[PDB]
Design an enzyme around this catalytic site. Structure first.
Site, PDB file in Angstrom:
ATOM      1  N   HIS A  17      -0.918 -12.469  -2.328  1.00 10.44           N
ATOM      2  CA  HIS A  17      -2.022 -13.298  -1.730  1.00 10.44           C
ATOM      3  C   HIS A  17      -1.567 -14.750  -1.511  1.00 10.44           C
ATOM      4  O   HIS A  17      -2.365 -15.584  -1.146  1.00 10.44           O
ATOM      5  CB  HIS A  17      -3.320 -13.162  -2.531  1.00 10.44           C
ATOM      6  CG  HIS A  17      -3.905 -11.776  -2.424  1.00 10.44           C
ATOM      7  ND1 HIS A  17      -5.004 -11.323  -3.135  1.00 10.44           N
ATOM      8  CD2 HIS A  17      -3.451 -10.725  -1.695  1.00 10.44           C
ATOM      9  CE1 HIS A  17      -5.255 -10.048  -2.752  1.00 10.44           C
ATOM     10  NE2 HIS A  17      -4.292  -9.609  -1.884  1.00 10.44           N
ATOM     11  N   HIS A  66       0.802  -1.230   0.000  1.00  5.42           N
ATOM     12  CA  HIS A  66       0.000   0.000   0.000  1.00  5.42           C
ATOM     13  C   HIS A  66       0.821   1.260   0.000  1.00  5.42           C
ATOM     14  O   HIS A  66       0.389   2.295  -0.564  1.00  5.42           O
ATOM     15  CB  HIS A  66      -0.937   0.025   1.176  1.00  5.42           C
ATOM     16  CG  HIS A  66      -2.149  -0.859   1.006  1.00  5.42           C
ATOM     17  ND1 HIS A  66      -3.358  -0.571   1.601  1.00  5.42           N
ATOM     18  CD2 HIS A  66      -2.310  -1.986   0.290  1.00  5.42           C
ATOM     19  CE1 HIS A  66      -4.204  -1.576   1.263  1.00  5.42           C
ATOM     20  NE2 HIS A  66      -3.597  -2.418   0.461  1.00  5.42           N
TER      21      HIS A  66
HETATM   22  C1  HEM Z   1      -6.253  -6.205  -7.391  1.00  4.95           C
HETATM   23  C2  HEM Z   1      -5.330  -5.927  -6.512  1.00  4.95           C
HETATM   24  C3  HEM Z   1      -5.505  -6.226  -5.096  1.00  4.95           C
HETATM   25  C4  HEM Z   1      -6.706  -6.212  -4.317  1.00  4.95           C
HETATM   26  C5  HEM Z   1      -8.156  -5.874  -4.724  1.00  4.95           C
HETATM   27  C6  HEM Z   1      -6.361  -6.559  -2.961  1.00  4.95           C
HETATM   28  C7  HEM Z   1      -7.203  -6.612  -1.876  1.00  4.95           C
HETATM   29  C8  HEM Z   1      -6.827  -6.955  -0.542  1.00  4.95           C
HETATM   30  C9  HEM Z   1      -7.755  -6.887   0.548  1.00  4.95           C
HETATM   31  C10 HEM Z   1      -9.242  -6.412   0.422  1.00  4.95           C
HETATM   32  C11 HEM Z   1      -7.058  -7.302   1.664  1.00  4.95           C
HETATM   33  C12 HEM Z   1      -7.603  -7.527   3.049  1.00  4.95           C
HETATM   34  C13 HEM Z   1      -7.415  -6.368   4.003  1.00  4.95           C
HETATM   35  C14 HEM Z   1      -7.808  -6.848   5.395  1.00  4.95           C
HETATM   36  O1  HEM Z   1      -9.056  -7.094   5.510  1.00  4.95           O
HETATM   37  O2  HEM Z   1      -6.957  -7.086   6.263  1.00  4.95           O
HETATM   38  C15 HEM Z   1      -5.778  -7.654   1.228  1.00  4.95           C
HETATM   39  C16 HEM Z   1      -4.819  -8.256   1.958  1.00  4.95           C
HETATM   40  C17 HEM Z   1      -3.507  -8.470   1.588  1.00  4.95           C
HETATM   41  N1  HEM Z   1      -2.937  -8.199   0.290  1.00  4.95           N
HETATM   42 FE1  HEM Z   1      -3.976  -7.617  -1.300  1.00  4.95          FE
HETATM   43  N2  HEM Z   1      -5.030  -6.891  -2.904  1.00  4.95           N
HETATM   44  C18 HEM Z   1      -4.424  -6.584  -4.134  1.00  4.95           C
HETATM   45  C19 HEM Z   1      -3.047  -6.655  -4.437  1.00  4.95           C
HETATM   46  C20 HEM Z   1      -2.047  -6.978  -3.603  1.00  4.95           C
HETATM   47  C21 HEM Z   1      -0.654  -6.878  -3.942  1.00  4.95           C
HETATM   48  C22 HEM Z   1      -0.112  -6.391  -5.258  1.00  4.95           C
HETATM   49  C23 HEM Z   1       0.009  -7.418  -2.875  1.00  4.95           C
HETATM   50  C24 HEM Z   1       1.533  -7.515  -2.685  1.00  4.95           C
HETATM   51  C25 HEM Z   1       2.344  -7.870  -3.606  1.00  4.95           C
HETATM   52  C26 HEM Z   1      -0.955  -7.626  -1.812  1.00  4.95           C
HETATM   53  C27 HEM Z   1      -0.653  -8.222  -0.588  1.00  4.95           C
HETATM   54  C28 HEM Z   1      -1.600  -8.491   0.415  1.00  4.95           C
HETATM   55  C29 HEM Z   1      -1.377  -9.247   1.655  1.00  4.95           C
HETATM   56  C30 HEM Z   1      -0.044  -9.835   1.977  1.00  4.95           C
HETATM   57  C31 HEM Z   1      -2.533  -9.221   2.315  1.00  4.95           C
HETATM   58  C32 HEM Z   1      -2.724  -9.832   3.703  1.00  4.95           C
HETATM   59  C33 HEM Z   1      -2.644  -8.905   4.897  1.00  4.95           C
HETATM   60  C34 HEM Z   1      -2.611  -9.566   6.253  1.00  4.95           C
HETATM   61  O3  HEM Z   1      -2.156 -10.740   6.385  1.00  4.95           O
HETATM   62  O4  HEM Z   1      -2.869  -8.849   7.253  1.00  4.95           O
HETATM   63  N3  HEM Z   1      -2.196  -7.456  -2.346  1.00  4.95           N
HETATM   64  N4  HEM Z   1      -5.715  -7.567  -0.203  1.00  4.95           N
END
Ligand code: HEM
Ligand code: HEM
Ligand SMILES: [Cl-]
Ligand SMILES: [Cl-]
Ligand code: NA
Ligand code: NA
EC number: 1.11.1.21
Lengths: 713, 713
Positions: free
Chosen positions: B244, B77
């Protein structure tokens, strides 16, 4: 484009502390306006201004063939925005040329006045500021029309962006009282710090209070607003009747003919506004206030005709051609000249607020005296004009040029000249050792010096430690100054002083003003030693002691700190949150955000809080100069919540045990909450920051100690 | 308190040019972050971060006993706000810790993640910036969980106030498209320069476009937003599936349980926000997005289980406990671990936008290749993660520390090493005389150098004259660069270059990039001499020439100036008035308002306008460096009116005669209209200002020439 202010309209605004940076200033960072001015050929400028008076331009023709009344009004309005409550407004920054003041309805057509002055500004360049030029032009207008002025000083440096001033909360120009954002409550009580009756007016409404044409009630508004501008009844009557000896008002047709103010106008208007569709839009057809009054038989010459007319006729309520309320002389002949047509004469007329000077009983007695003794009137008006146009310039040390009046005036908060050798560095070391040997504590020494120095405000350059006024009424009795504690420190310092001065040779002596400051410096040194640091705090002697007779007690009242976050002090409950009052004080002190941050965190640990309050005292080594405030404030081991007794006091408990560790106020905890403040606190709460903290504290401490030292400029 | 922006909400805002003053910066004027960072024990910082990954705090317990997923999301982010259109956003300034980004709904609970890092920040102090630490933490997360990163560079200096960025015009967070401030028009066309589908989102809505859970349509929004962040389909699939692979989403209860974002929260929340009334408010009860998905069977370990699950199950639409649309695997066993209860397992789940990677036909091909070849996936992800997190850092010369990847990447706009002696001062003088003897004119030389240097933007540190990319596609063919005229100048300079370099010994040579800048310097000196003034313009050699093959033509497209007020150029008609686009350009160039003013007035009289337009050329001595722009603009003898044919072109006529004197655009006449700009124009238009004007012009010219010179940092 949505901004942070849109989303969080109540978050604090720190950009007020970072105005006036070197970024927005077109002059190089070493430019010194005083040096430029002192080489100006002031006589040459005055000759050109005299010429201009009768050099009519077709785009805004001169009434009676002489711009002097317009220019007098221009200078009066420049000065007229001043408020004693905070010192903000006034002529001293040239702010009439920027928003919002360039576009206030009461400043209509003063854009034309300023534009007439561009050729002279251009010709003299940086050697005369706009700020100085607006006032000098008013002086020359007076002299040109036969009035001898009391003097003039230069030295008003130009500014380059709008100053941040609270002008009110109304969202409508000229809104009458009792609206959702009213500036009036109760029995016509005007909210502090405001000094005008409606948004976009200078003092009062020329038609009467809220437009009601009652001279007696208008007088009450006049008295209140002029008092909020530092003027008493004699000064007020002299200034109104003096100004309205000259020129005329403008209301030749309906107001709906007048277009956009300058900041709203199209780009082709090239900075002017109020374009009028009424007839030729100018000259004979001008519309400015909507009133149509010409006061005297000779509007281009000093006379005693204002008071002759005021008392020599009875007055009837009428309306101008725009519909505004005004007064006309019953049974008079057409004796007042027309501004443009020599075949036309008019009856004498007056504004509601001019009639105030006859129908308010206290003003009537002054007015009569002026009518009977015109030399009294002339002298009072000259003195009042000088005060009006210099009241925000600060100490006389800042006054520049060959026309500065020699007479010392009480409103200048005068400081005696020094006429004896000053203490040197060896003397300063001897006096600081005496102070530390007396038993006075770090908390006492820091608190006293802080109280003395922190009355300064950069808005009108009043206050500060020079003068030793902390020892006089009323400062010695202010609650924030802790009068009983203060008295004990002052007696101890006065005995040191007496002993030092009695041992000297030659005429060398130390003033109490200097000793208060030096004793504060010794406190800070001692606190650094308490923390295991060797620190030397800079000290510049040369302050003198003013007398009680040199200290107007009623004028000093507006310097009383009713809120001083630096000492965790709030005298009562206010509607504005304490952290906003802290930023406001920092701005008056001329502090940036980093300087405010470092200063407050150091003061908390030195014991500078009023009453020895523990609020914000986040250390176990009080009176030692450390960054403990920051390290402890930022410790996520502590959880904070408001108390049930008081929502503005917070308790900080251990997160794991519940145990109470600290208490703090909003001014303490903002540093942990505001995302910009917290970023600054983090620098000073880091492991590598103790030496930085000490050195930045000493620098800001010294800065505050020197704020009024224009003798060293 | 009513402000100027309340009264005149459309006036231009110049305070964007005056941020980042030495007033607001807590570090001293001599602080140099690179010198601090270079002595940081980066290995020790990384060890501390590694330990932190499994050290849970009870105010925000670690999912799975490991903060790595949280920190990856935080770093993503931090980087993810970047827009290629203007270069604004990205991780390079640490802006996540200020408003508004600290309080965006997509950044919910990253407040907690940043707070977890305060002890490390505090420990290492000024030697590691917040900006570098956010990225470093995400790399350590990845490494801790068994992923091999591509490398890391330090050097992102911290900032101390919010950046001025246009994030959209909506007044409500997460507003669906089609409102009164919609950011979409036509067939789902997102307005430039925005790179997110809703206000407060990073790229896209995880439920689907405007909340509709269709993976095919979601994929369109993913492709469009990621391309607006400089990422292609391979990189997009690598990043989404890579990220993810780790951690989980949080949606344990209804969203109405979650309270105010940090900027709106009470003072006692000490900078945190989103406090939740749902059960314990944290850990197993956490609510962040409202979604409740855990992607892999080992959320704390790198794997290829994201694609194994994506392709090995069919998926059913379901709702989280907060009511958000998400997907669950049909017929699956409970194989996904629970974050806190080791006796509970769950079925695989996915977001709509995860399913995009299988149901969009282009994505599906990449995703299948990654599933079959997880080593390809790992290398693409590592490369993409480096690019994401470095894309706004600027030239590789800025990259600091021991983990900088040696591979040169095309997206870096790379500049070859210089491997020969540079020209000295005498060589520079010889070349400036040769350039002037060639017949090239002041206008040619100034225009060419301006075109080359003014592609710089301080938002992402791309562009500038280094590289001599003005000679390559696509710069050589941009309309603003006047392709036929530019080609003639470049041929002449290339002949001078060949002749000088062929005469040298010892391997000394001059690059074309340097000679383009040097030749502009000769033009400015020649213009000064034309005005009767000898001045030397500073010049620093050491630029190198990049090849076509080292130049990504499609990435260079966003650097094209479609509006350049400094050349009175507007490629088409825009919604935003031209004076607003001038200020935007000046902010990208890092200019203050005085710098912008001087520069513009000087370029006007040097012949820098595109097409040799006369608009704003207020001089009868074109190609002489004078202040004539200001003197003539400010002359009240001239009256201005918009033309009938074009309301954005103005005629200046003699006020008395009507005779046509000049034409101008909005960008020329704003300097005579805006009250702060006019004040600046007045300084340079005064009779004492010729020396000042020339000096200040040369200084801002040299500043622009050197904007990309981080080799001299
Ligand atoms: C279309 C693009 C993407 C969408 C719509 C998206 C959406 C989200 C959402 C809605 C969350 C959950 C937030 C929460 O409720 O804690 C999340 C978590 C996360 N995203 Fe994404 N994401 C995207 C791209 C990415 C990218 C590019 C990465 C890194 C390379 C990333 C890494 C993460 C990780 C690691 C989590 C987990 C957080 C945790 O364990 O607390 N995401 N994502
Ligand atoms: C109760 C206080 C005052 C009120 C309500 C007031 C009101 C106004 C109004 C409404 C105008 C007409 C503007 C226009 O239509 O052109 C004006 C004109 C003027 N006032 Fe005042 N005034 C006050 C005090 C002052 C003071 C203290 C001075 C100066 C010492 C001053 C000097 C002038 C002059 C010289 C004009 C004539 C302008 C011209 O000839 O263009 N007034 N006054
Ligand atoms: Cl002010
Ligand atoms: Cl930004
Ligand atoms: Na003031
Ligand atoms: Na950026």
């Amino acid at each position: 484009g949505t901004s942070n202010r849109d989303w969080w309209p109540n978050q604090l605004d720190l950009s007020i502390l970072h105005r006036h940076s070197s970024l927005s200033d077109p002059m190089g960072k070493d430019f010194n306006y005083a040096q430029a001015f002192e080489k100006l050929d002031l006589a040459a400028v005055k000759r050109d201004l005299h010429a201009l008076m009768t050099t009519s331009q077709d785009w805004w023709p001169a009434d009676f063939g002489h711009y002097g009344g317009l220019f007098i009004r221009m200078a009066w309005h420049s000065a007229g925005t001043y408020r004693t409550a905070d010192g903000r407004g006034g002529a001293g920054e040239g702010q009439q040329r920027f928003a919002p003041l360039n576009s206030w309805p009461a400043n209509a057509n003063l854009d034309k006045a300023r534009r007439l002055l561009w050729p002279i500004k251009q010709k003299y360049g940086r050697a005369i500021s706009w700020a100085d030029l607006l006032i000098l032009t008013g002086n020359v207008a007076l002299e040109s029309m036969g009035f001898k002025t009391f003097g003039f000083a230069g030295g008003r440096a130009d500014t380059w962006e709008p100053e941040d001033v609270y002008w009110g909360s109304e969202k409508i120009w000229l809104e009458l009282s009792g609206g959702p954002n009213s500036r009036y409550s109760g029995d016509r009580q005007l909210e502090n710090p405001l000094a005008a009756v409606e948004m976009g007016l200078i003092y009062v409404d020329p038609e009467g209070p809220d437009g009601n044409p009652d001279p007696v009630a208008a007088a009450r508004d006049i008295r209140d607003t002029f008092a909020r501008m530092a003027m008493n009844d004699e000064e007020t009557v002299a200034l109104i009747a003096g100004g309205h000896t000259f020129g005329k008002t403008h209301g030749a047709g309906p107001a709906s003919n007048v277009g956009a103010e300058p900041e709203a106008a199209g780009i082709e208007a090239q900075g002017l506004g109020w374009k009028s569709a009424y007839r030729t839009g100018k000259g004979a057809d001008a519309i400015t206030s909507g009133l149509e009054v010409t006061w005297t038989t000779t509007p281009t010459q000093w006379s005693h005709n204002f008071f002759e007319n005021l008392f020599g006729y009875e007055w009837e309520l009428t309306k101008s051609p725009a519909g505004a309320h005004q007064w006309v002389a019953k049974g008079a002949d057409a004796v007042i000249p027309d501004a443009f047509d020599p075949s036309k004469k008019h009856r004498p007329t007056m504004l509601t607020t001019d009639l105030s000077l006859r129908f308010d009983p206290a003003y009537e007695k002054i007015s009569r005296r002026f009518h009977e003794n015109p030399e009294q009137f002339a002298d009072a008006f000259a003195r009042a004009w000088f005060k009006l146009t210099h009241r925000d310039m600060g100490p006389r040390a800042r006054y520049l040029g060959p026309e500065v009046p020699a007479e010392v005036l009480l409103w200048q908060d005068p400081i005696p000249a020094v006429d004896h050798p000053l203490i040197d560095a060896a003397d300063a070391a001897e006096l600081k050792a005496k102070v530390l040997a007396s038993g006075l504590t770090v908390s006492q020494l820091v608190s006293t010096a802080w109280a003395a120095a922190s009355t300064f405000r950069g808005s009108d350059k009043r206050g500060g430690a020079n003068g030793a006024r902390i020892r006089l009424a009323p400062q010695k009795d202010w609650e924030a100054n802790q009068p009983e504690q203060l008295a004990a420190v002052l007696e101890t310092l006065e005995a040191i002083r007496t002993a030092f001065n009695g041992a000297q040779r030659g005429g060398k002596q130390v003033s109490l003003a200097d000793l208060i400051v030096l004793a504060g410096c010794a406190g800070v040194e001692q606190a650094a030693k308490n923390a295991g640091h060797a620190v030397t705090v800079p000290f510049a002697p040369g302050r003198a002691d003013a007398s009680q007779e040199q200290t107007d007690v009623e004028s000093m009242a507006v310097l009383e700190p009713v809120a001083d976050g630096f000492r965790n002090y709030l005298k009562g409950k206010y509607r504005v949150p304490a952290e906003v009052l802290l930023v406001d004080k920092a701005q008056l002190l001329t502090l940036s955000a980093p300087e405010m941050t470092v200063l407050l965190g150091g003061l908390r640990v030195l014991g500078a809080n009023v009453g020895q309050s523990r609020h914000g005292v986040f250390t176990a080594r009080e009176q030692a100069l450390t960054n403990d405030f920051f390290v402890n404030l930022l410790d996520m081991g502590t959880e904070w919540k408001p108390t049930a007794a008081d929502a503005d006091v917070f308790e900080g408990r251990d997160r794991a045990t519940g145990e109470l560790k600290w208490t703090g106020t909003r001014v303490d905890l903002v540093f942990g909450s505001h995302s910009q403040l917290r970023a600054l606190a983090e620098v000073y709460g880091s492991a590598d920051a103790q030496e930085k903290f000490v050195r930045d504290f000493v620098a800001v401490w010294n800065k505050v100690m020197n704020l009024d030292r224009f003798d060293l400029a």
